[PDB]
Short mmCIF file of C-alpha atoms in Angstrom, two decimals:
data_model
loop_
_atom_site.label_atom_id
_atom_site.label_comp_id
_atom_site.label_asym_id
_atom_site.label_seq_id
_atom_site.Cartn_x
_atom_site.Cartn_y
_atom_site.Cartn_z
CA UNK A 20 -1.19 16.60 13.46
CA UNK A 21 1.66 16.52 10.71
CA UNK A 22 3.63 14.03 12.70
CA UNK A 23 7.32 11.80 11.47
CA UNK A 24 9.33 9.37 12.54
CA UNK A 25 13.42 10.46 13.51
CA UNK A 26 15.30 7.67 15.40
CA UNK A 27 18.11 8.81 16.82
CA UNK A 28 21.71 7.09 18.00
CA UNK A 29 23.14 6.11 20.84
CA UNK A 30 26.67 6.60 21.94
CA UNK A 31 26.72 3.96 24.66
CA UNK A 32 24.41 1.97 22.90
CA UNK A 33 25.01 2.45 19.45
CA UNK A 34 22.68 -0.69 17.69
CA UNK A 35 20.12 0.40 20.23
CA UNK A 36 17.73 2.59 17.82
CA UNK A 37 15.09 3.97 19.15
CA UNK A 38 12.72 4.93 16.87
CA UNK A 39 12.31 8.76 18.15
CA UNK A 40 9.00 9.99 16.25
CA UNK A 41 9.69 13.98 16.44
CA UNK A 42 6.22 16.78 16.88
CA UNK A 43 6.57 19.93 15.29
CA UNK A 44 5.23 23.24 14.90
CA UNK A 45 4.10 25.26 12.25
CA UNK A 46 6.75 27.34 10.15
CA UNK A 47 10.21 27.47 12.25
CA UNK A 48 10.56 31.38 11.19
CA UNK A 49 8.34 31.91 13.90
CA UNK A 50 9.39 29.47 16.41
CA UNK A 51 9.87 25.61 16.34
CA UNK A 52 9.57 22.36 19.33
CA UNK A 53 12.00 19.09 18.72
CA UNK A 54 10.69 15.88 20.51
CA UNK A 55 13.27 13.51 22.87
CA UNK A 56 12.41 9.76 23.79
CA UNK A 57 14.42 7.23 25.80
CA UNK A 58 12.69 4.07 25.94
CA UNK A 59 12.13 4.43 29.64
CA UNK A 60 10.28 8.11 29.57
CA UNK A 61 8.17 9.84 27.45
CA UNK A 62 8.56 14.00 26.85
CA UNK A 63 6.67 15.48 24.26
CA UNK A 64 6.00 19.66 25.84
CA UNK A 65 5.87 22.41 22.85
CA UNK A 66 8.11 25.68 23.80
CA UNK A 67 6.93 28.66 24.60
CA UNK A 68 6.78 32.34 22.28
CA UNK A 69 9.67 35.30 22.88
CA UNK A 70 12.62 33.23 22.58
CA UNK A 71 13.01 33.07 18.60
CA UNK A 72 13.35 37.38 18.17
CA UNK A 73 15.72 38.16 20.63
CA UNK A 74 18.12 35.35 19.50
CA UNK A 75 18.26 34.86 16.36
CA UNK A 76 19.17 37.99 14.93
CA UNK A 77 21.09 40.06 17.13
CA UNK A 78 25.21 39.23 16.57
CA UNK A 79 25.04 40.83 13.28
CA UNK A 80 25.05 37.32 10.39
CA UNK A 81 23.56 36.70 7.42
CA UNK A 82 20.12 34.77 7.72
CA UNK A 83 20.73 32.80 5.12
CA UNK A 84 23.18 30.87 6.80
CA UNK A 85 20.47 30.59 9.82
CA UNK A 86 17.60 29.31 7.74
CA UNK A 87 18.95 27.30 5.19
CA UNK A 88 20.78 24.86 8.27
CA UNK A 89 17.23 25.33 9.51
CA UNK A 90 15.06 23.95 7.43
CA UNK A 91 17.86 21.53 5.46
CA UNK A 92 17.97 19.79 9.52
CA UNK A 93 14.33 18.30 8.43
CA UNK A 94 13.59 17.80 4.60
CA UNK A 95 23.76 12.14 10.89
CA UNK A 96 23.03 14.40 13.43
CA UNK A 97 24.95 12.91 15.70
CA UNK A 98 22.56 13.21 18.45
CA UNK A 99 24.74 13.79 22.03
CA UNK A 100 21.96 12.76 24.55
CA UNK A 101 23.48 12.78 27.49
CA UNK A 102 21.31 11.12 30.34
CA UNK A 103 24.24 12.41 32.70
CA UNK A 104 23.69 16.09 31.09
CA UNK A 105 19.31 15.09 31.48
CA UNK A 106 19.63 17.83 28.82
CA UNK A 107 19.01 18.12 25.06
CA UNK A 108 22.62 19.55 24.00
CA UNK A 109 24.53 18.16 20.99
CA UNK A 110 27.73 19.00 18.95
CA UNK A 111 27.68 19.76 15.86
CA UNK A 112 31.09 18.15 15.05
CA UNK A 113 29.89 17.18 10.99
CA UNK A 114 31.68 18.30 7.57
CA UNK A 115 31.30 22.49 6.50
CA UNK A 116 28.67 22.77 9.15
CA UNK A 117 29.69 23.04 12.86
CA UNK A 118 27.63 25.84 14.52
CA UNK A 119 24.97 25.85 17.49
CA UNK A 120 21.63 25.15 16.41
CA UNK A 121 18.34 25.25 18.18
CA UNK A 122 17.55 26.88 22.13
CA UNK A 123 15.82 24.60 23.65
CA UNK A 124 14.23 24.02 27.02
CA UNK A 125 13.64 20.54 28.09
CA UNK A 126 10.26 18.71 27.17
CA UNK A 127 9.02 17.96 30.87
CA UNK A 128 5.30 17.22 30.87
CA UNK A 129 2.95 15.38 33.29
CA UNK A 130 1.45 13.06 30.84
CA UNK A 131 4.05 10.81 29.68
CA UNK A 132 1.56 7.48 28.23
CA UNK A 133 -1.30 10.50 26.40
CA UNK A 134 1.43 11.07 23.35
CA UNK A 135 2.06 7.11 23.19
CA UNK A 136 -1.39 5.79 22.87
CA UNK A 137 -2.36 8.99 20.06
CA UNK A 138 0.63 7.69 18.50
CA UNK A 139 -0.12 4.29 18.22
CA UNK A 140 -3.71 4.47 18.05
CA UNK A 141 -2.88 6.71 14.89
CA UNK A 142 -0.97 3.91 13.60
CA UNK A 143 -3.58 1.74 13.74
CA UNK A 144 -5.58 3.91 11.83
CA UNK A 145 -3.27 4.45 9.16
CA UNK A 146 -2.39 0.67 8.87
CA UNK A 147 -5.76 0.00 7.93
CA UNK A 148 -6.63 2.56 6.04
CA UNK A 149 -3.49 0.88 4.28
CA UNK A 150 -4.83 -2.26 3.82
CA UNK A 151 -8.50 -1.44 3.11
CA UNK A 152 -7.18 0.99 0.19
CA UNK A 153 -4.69 -2.03 -1.12
CA UNK A 154 -6.57 -4.02 -1.45
CA UNK A 155 -9.45 -2.04 -3.32
CA UNK A 156 -6.87 -1.23 -5.75
CA UNK A 157 -5.97 -5.00 -6.28
CA UNK A 158 -9.38 -5.96 -6.94
CA UNK A 159 -9.73 -2.35 -9.37
CA UNK A 160 -6.65 -3.77 -10.93
CA UNK A 161 -7.47 -7.34 -11.84
CA UNK A 162 -11.15 -6.24 -12.57
CA UNK A 163 -8.93 -3.67 -14.97
CA UNK A 164 -7.06 -6.24 -16.20
CA UNK A 165 -9.75 -8.96 -17.61
CA UNK A 166 -10.38 -5.73 -18.95
CA UNK A 167 -8.02 -5.05 -20.84
CA UNK A 168 -7.27 -8.56 -21.76
CA UNK A 169 -11.34 -9.33 -23.68
CA UNK A 170 -11.15 -6.43 -25.18
CA UNK A 171 -8.05 -7.17 -26.82
CA UNK A 172 -9.07 -10.80 -27.40
CA UNK A 173 -12.92 -9.38 -29.03
CA UNK A 174 -9.99 -6.96 -31.09
CA UNK A 175 -8.12 -9.52 -32.06
CA UNK A 176 -10.99 -11.14 -33.27
CA UNK A 177 -12.32 -8.39 -34.76
CA UNK A 178 -8.91 -7.67 -36.87
CA UNK A 179 -8.34 -11.72 -38.23
CA UNK A 180 -11.64 -12.16 -39.46
CA UNK A 181 -11.78 -8.54 -41.58
CA UNK A 182 -8.04 -9.50 -42.91
CA UNK A 183 -9.22 -12.82 -43.70
CA UNK A 184 -12.40 -11.82 -45.79
CA UNK A 185 -9.87 -9.17 -46.81
CA UNK A 186 -7.36 -11.69 -48.26
CA UNK A 187 -9.93 -13.61 -49.44
CA UNK A 188 -11.13 -10.72 -51.47
CA UNK A 189 -7.58 -10.03 -52.52
CA UNK A 190 -7.13 -13.01 -53.68
CA UNK A 191 -10.58 -13.79 -56.21
CA UNK A 192 -9.28 -10.40 -57.56
CA UNK A 193 -5.95 -11.46 -58.27
CA UNK A 194 -7.13 -14.13 -59.73
CA UNK A 195 -9.87 -12.56 -62.22
CA UNK A 196 -7.36 -9.86 -62.87
CA UNK A 197 -5.24 -12.81 -64.14
CA UNK A 198 -7.45 -14.22 -66.33
CA UNK A 199 -8.20 -10.77 -67.27
CA UNK A 200 -4.40 -10.35 -68.18
CA UNK A 201 -4.54 -14.38 -69.63
CA UNK A 202 -8.00 -13.02 -72.09
CA UNK A 203 -6.01 -10.14 -73.99
CA UNK A 204 -2.85 -11.74 -73.78
CA UNK A 205 -4.89 -13.88 -76.27
CA UNK A 206 -7.03 -11.97 -77.48
CA UNK A 207 -3.60 -9.51 -79.24
CA UNK A 208 -2.36 -12.90 -80.13
CA UNK A 209 -5.23 -13.89 -82.50
CA UNK A 210 -5.39 -9.85 -83.78
CA UNK A 211 -2.17 -10.90 -84.32
CA UNK A 212 -2.70 -13.80 -86.86
CA UNK A 213 -5.57 -12.13 -88.63
CA UNK B 21 5.15 -15.82 9.44
CA UNK B 22 3.18 -12.10 10.02
CA UNK B 23 2.88 -10.05 13.59
CA UNK B 24 0.06 -7.95 13.97
CA UNK B 25 -0.96 -5.49 17.19
CA UNK B 26 -4.27 -5.15 17.70
CA UNK B 27 -5.28 -2.46 20.98
CA UNK B 28 -7.46 -3.36 22.73
CA UNK B 29 -8.68 -0.23 24.86
CA UNK B 30 -11.44 -0.22 27.89
CA UNK B 31 -13.74 3.09 28.17
CA UNK B 32 -13.47 3.53 31.17
CA UNK B 33 -9.83 3.22 31.59
CA UNK B 34 -7.17 4.24 29.31
CA UNK B 35 -4.16 3.81 31.27
CA UNK B 36 -4.35 -0.74 30.20
CA UNK B 37 -4.25 -1.85 26.88
CA UNK B 38 -3.08 -5.07 25.54
CA UNK B 39 -0.44 -6.33 23.02
CA UNK B 40 -0.43 -9.34 21.06
CA UNK B 41 2.35 -10.66 18.94
CA UNK B 42 1.03 -13.87 18.37
CA UNK B 43 3.30 -16.19 15.93
CA UNK B 44 0.27 -18.24 14.87
CA UNK B 45 0.62 -20.97 12.12
CA UNK B 46 -3.37 -22.59 10.85
CA UNK B 47 -4.49 -23.30 14.00
CA UNK B 48 -4.45 -22.43 17.44
CA UNK B 49 -4.49 -24.67 19.86
CA UNK B 50 -1.41 -24.68 20.96
CA UNK B 51 1.05 -22.87 22.91
CA UNK B 52 0.90 -20.12 21.59
CA UNK B 53 2.74 -15.81 22.66
CA UNK B 54 0.97 -13.17 23.88
CA UNK B 55 2.68 -9.90 26.00
CA UNK B 56 1.59 -7.56 28.42
CA UNK B 57 3.26 -4.50 30.25
CA UNK B 58 2.83 -1.14 31.42
CA UNK B 59 5.40 0.51 30.78
CA UNK B 60 8.03 -0.22 31.62
CA UNK B 61 7.94 -4.36 32.82
CA UNK B 62 6.18 -7.16 30.68
CA UNK B 63 5.10 -10.56 31.74
CA UNK B 64 5.04 -12.81 28.72
CA UNK B 65 3.63 -16.67 28.61
CA UNK B 66 2.38 -19.29 27.33
CA UNK B 67 -0.51 -21.51 27.82
CA UNK B 68 0.02 -25.88 26.72
CA UNK B 69 -3.37 -28.02 25.77
CA UNK B 70 -4.49 -27.76 29.53
CA UNK B 71 -7.62 -27.11 29.38
CA UNK B 72 -9.19 -26.61 26.50
CA UNK B 73 -11.63 -29.51 26.31
CA UNK B 74 -13.94 -27.80 28.38
CA UNK B 75 -14.32 -25.73 26.54
CA UNK B 76 -15.60 -28.53 23.58
CA UNK B 77 -17.54 -30.35 26.13
CA UNK B 78 -19.52 -29.03 28.35
CA UNK B 79 -21.80 -26.23 25.71
CA UNK B 80 -20.60 -29.37 23.34
CA UNK B 81 -19.27 -27.53 20.70
CA UNK B 82 -16.51 -29.17 18.36
CA UNK B 83 -13.03 -26.73 16.53
CA UNK B 84 -13.41 -23.68 14.28
CA UNK B 85 -15.83 -22.21 16.56
CA UNK B 86 -13.14 -22.05 18.74
CA UNK B 87 -11.30 -21.55 16.61
CA UNK B 88 -13.11 -18.56 14.48
CA UNK B 89 -14.09 -17.05 17.04
CA UNK B 90 -9.92 -16.73 18.72
CA UNK B 91 -9.67 -15.58 15.14
CA UNK B 92 -12.08 -12.57 15.77
CA UNK B 93 -11.21 -11.73 19.25
CA UNK B 94 -7.01 -12.24 19.30
CA UNK B 95 -7.33 -9.34 16.08
CA UNK B 96 -8.86 -5.68 15.12
CA UNK B 97 -12.77 -5.70 15.85
CA UNK B 98 -14.88 -4.88 18.40
CA UNK B 99 -19.14 -4.63 18.91
CA UNK B 100 -20.59 -1.49 20.13
CA UNK B 101 -24.11 -3.32 21.62
CA UNK B 102 -21.51 -6.03 22.94
CA UNK B 103 -19.76 -5.05 25.96
CA UNK B 104 -16.40 -6.37 26.49
CA UNK B 105 -15.31 -6.70 30.28
CA UNK B 106 -11.41 -7.39 30.63
CA UNK B 107 -11.80 -7.08 34.67
CA UNK B 108 -7.83 -6.92 34.97
CA UNK B 109 -7.34 -6.98 38.92
CA UNK B 110 -4.50 -5.64 39.80
CA UNK B 111 -6.05 -5.33 43.83
CA UNK B 112 -6.61 -8.55 44.47
CA UNK B 113 -3.21 -9.96 42.25
CA UNK B 114 -5.00 -12.61 41.03
CA UNK B 115 -4.81 -12.58 37.19
CA UNK B 116 -7.89 -14.46 35.54
CA UNK B 117 -10.18 -13.12 33.15
CA UNK B 118 -13.83 -13.62 32.43
CA UNK B 119 -16.10 -13.21 29.08
CA UNK B 120 -19.91 -12.65 31.03
CA UNK B 121 -23.51 -12.67 29.03
CA UNK B 122 -27.20 -13.99 29.79
CA UNK B 123 -25.98 -13.99 33.80
CA UNK B 124 -23.90 -16.80 34.15
CA UNK B 125 -20.42 -17.04 34.44
CA UNK B 126 -18.49 -19.39 32.99
CA UNK B 127 -14.60 -20.23 30.95
CA UNK B 128 -12.82 -18.76 29.28
CA UNK B 129 -9.16 -19.71 28.99
CA UNK B 130 -6.28 -19.59 31.67
CA UNK B 131 -2.80 -17.76 31.13
CA UNK B 132 -0.45 -18.08 33.88
CA UNK B 133 2.55 -15.24 33.65
CA UNK B 134 6.48 -15.70 33.53
CA UNK B 135 8.44 -12.11 33.43
CA UNK B 136 10.07 -11.69 30.58
CA UNK B 137 14.16 -9.79 30.90
CA UNK B 138 14.02 -7.74 27.60
CA UNK B 139 11.26 -6.25 27.04
CA UNK B 140 12.27 -2.65 25.38
CA UNK B 141 14.18 -4.88 22.10
CA UNK B 142 10.98 -6.59 21.45
CA UNK B 143 9.32 -3.81 21.86
CA UNK B 144 11.85 -2.08 19.42
CA UNK B 145 11.29 -4.38 17.18
CA UNK B 146 7.76 -5.06 17.13
CA UNK B 147 6.93 -0.57 16.44
CA UNK B 148 10.17 -0.92 13.87
CA UNK B 149 7.98 -4.08 12.40
CA UNK B 150 4.88 -2.09 12.18
CA UNK B 151 6.33 0.66 10.55
CA UNK B 152 8.15 -1.26 8.01
CA UNK B 153 4.73 -2.91 6.85
CA UNK B 154 3.26 0.76 6.88
CA UNK B 155 6.03 1.23 4.18
CA UNK B 156 5.48 -2.07 3.03
CA UNK B 157 1.68 -1.06 2.25
CA UNK B 158 2.12 2.58 1.20
CA UNK B 159 4.56 1.15 -1.34
CA UNK B 160 2.02 -1.49 -2.45
CA UNK B 161 -1.26 1.30 -2.51
CA UNK B 162 0.68 3.52 -4.55
CA UNK B 163 2.16 1.28 -7.37
CA UNK B 164 -1.52 -0.44 -7.36
CA UNK B 165 -2.89 3.61 -8.28
CA UNK B 166 -0.19 3.63 -10.94
CA UNK B 167 -1.07 0.46 -12.33
CA UNK B 168 -4.81 0.92 -11.83
CA UNK B 169 -4.07 4.37 -14.02
CA UNK B 170 -2.09 2.91 -16.83
CA UNK B 171 -4.77 0.03 -16.86
CA UNK B 172 -7.46 2.48 -16.49
CA UNK B 173 -5.93 5.15 -19.79
CA UNK B 174 -5.16 1.53 -21.78
CA UNK B 175 -8.45 0.55 -21.92
CA UNK B 176 -9.15 4.24 -22.88
CA UNK B 177 -7.04 3.86 -25.82
CA UNK B 178 -7.88 0.51 -27.26
CA UNK B 179 -11.29 1.43 -27.32
CA UNK B 180 -10.87 4.38 -29.39
CA UNK B 181 -8.90 2.29 -31.90
CA UNK B 182 -11.92 -0.29 -32.18
CA UNK B 183 -14.02 2.28 -32.78
CA UNK B 184 -11.89 3.29 -34.66
CA UNK B 185 -11.61 0.54 -36.33
CA UNK B 186 -14.87 -0.76 -36.62
CA UNK B 187 -15.70 2.96 -38.02
CA UNK B 188 -13.49 2.49 -40.76
CA UNK B 189 -13.76 -0.86 -41.64
CA UNK B 190 -16.43 -0.24 -43.84
CA UNK B 191 -14.55 2.34 -45.46
CA UNK B 192 -11.66 0.76 -46.07
CA UNK B 193 -14.10 -2.79 -47.77
CA UNK B 194 -15.94 -0.31 -49.46
CA UNK B 195 -13.29 1.03 -51.33
CA UNK B 196 -11.45 -1.88 -52.40
CA UNK B 197 -14.78 -2.63 -53.28
CA UNK B 198 -14.84 0.17 -55.71
CA UNK B 199 -11.33 0.23 -56.42
CA UNK B 200 -12.07 -3.48 -57.75
CA UNK B 201 -14.80 -2.47 -59.73
CA UNK B 202 -12.89 0.57 -61.26
CA UNK B 203 -10.41 -2.03 -62.39
CA UNK B 204 -12.55 -4.73 -64.12
CA UNK B 205 -14.13 -2.04 -65.24
CA UNK B 206 -11.04 -0.97 -67.44
CA UNK B 207 -10.48 -4.81 -67.57
CA UNK B 208 -14.37 -4.35 -69.83
CA UNK B 209 -12.95 -1.81 -71.91
CA UNK B 210 -10.22 -2.99 -72.79
CA UNK B 211 -11.79 -6.06 -73.72
CA UNK B 212 -14.13 -4.26 -75.48
CA UNK B 213 -11.37 -2.33 -77.45
CA UNK B 214 -10.10 -5.62 -78.30
CA UNK B 215 -13.37 -6.89 -79.76
CA UNK B 216 -13.68 -3.83 -81.94
CA UNK B 217 -9.96 -4.33 -83.41
CA UNK B 218 -10.33 -8.23 -84.02
CA UNK B 219 -13.91 -7.51 -84.90
CA UNK B 220 -12.56 -6.03 -88.56
CA UNK B 221 -10.70 -8.27 -90.72
#
């Protein structure tokens, strides 16, 4: 399943960046699931149906001003997750965007460790694949560099030898033409005195 | 000084896993960093040069073999044929590890534990470093792919140019030959005409 890290920031501790890797679901037009963590407990629960259709288009608003913000929300968000309320409610106090987005039932499950275990397993697998492909492409790039270098070299030798032969032929032909011109000039000189 | 984490996953239970963010130089015979935690509390610790000579004297082995064993055990990698019994005895409240082979009990090492006071920060920095090295590896991967394809069609183009040059070198040399021949022939014709003109007196 597709999963991407979306780290969040706290107000009490603005320096501790809690790396929250959010787990989502299929296209957001038919329901969406957000993930939350705090570093001391794990919560990963998916929402159900019968919650999206009723609340989406009942207040008579344009469809764009909701779907556009929904799509731009994933592709700074003041996540005001407060432990005093234990609810994922955050005010969208952002310039030109001030509205409530997302009716979330806060995530709560019985197995907290499984999500973390699978996440770290995927991280290790992708690291290993990364180094493997890095090494493979390293040898490929190096061998292609050597092939380019020695092909360039052999081209250099062949062109240089051909050009040296061409220069020799040109010089010999120039000398022969100069001799012919001198002979013609001498013949004309003798013909003049004839 | 890089950091690597290898998950040793017991087939019997998936609850406990070991994190080894060891900072090592080109030797492993002194104090290092090992971390063990369950998710709420952590117990780190280091072992000095106290009990290592027995593992070189009893079975009369020298260094390097132990270094290689440490390097291929602490890092990632395991053998399906050789089962590993990582018995962490929580019920007896006594921390020790054993490596069983040929139905005999031997020694491998000792690790006393001292509880660390800041596990959250080190774990967060560890996961951040893991994400950073994933990003770096992926960037190097895409750059290497780009250079791979670039040198690939560079080789294609230079091979095509070489084939063109070796095909056209004979043609150009023949063109030069024929041009020189025609120039010499017209020079001979000029000499013939001059000879005919000088012949009459």
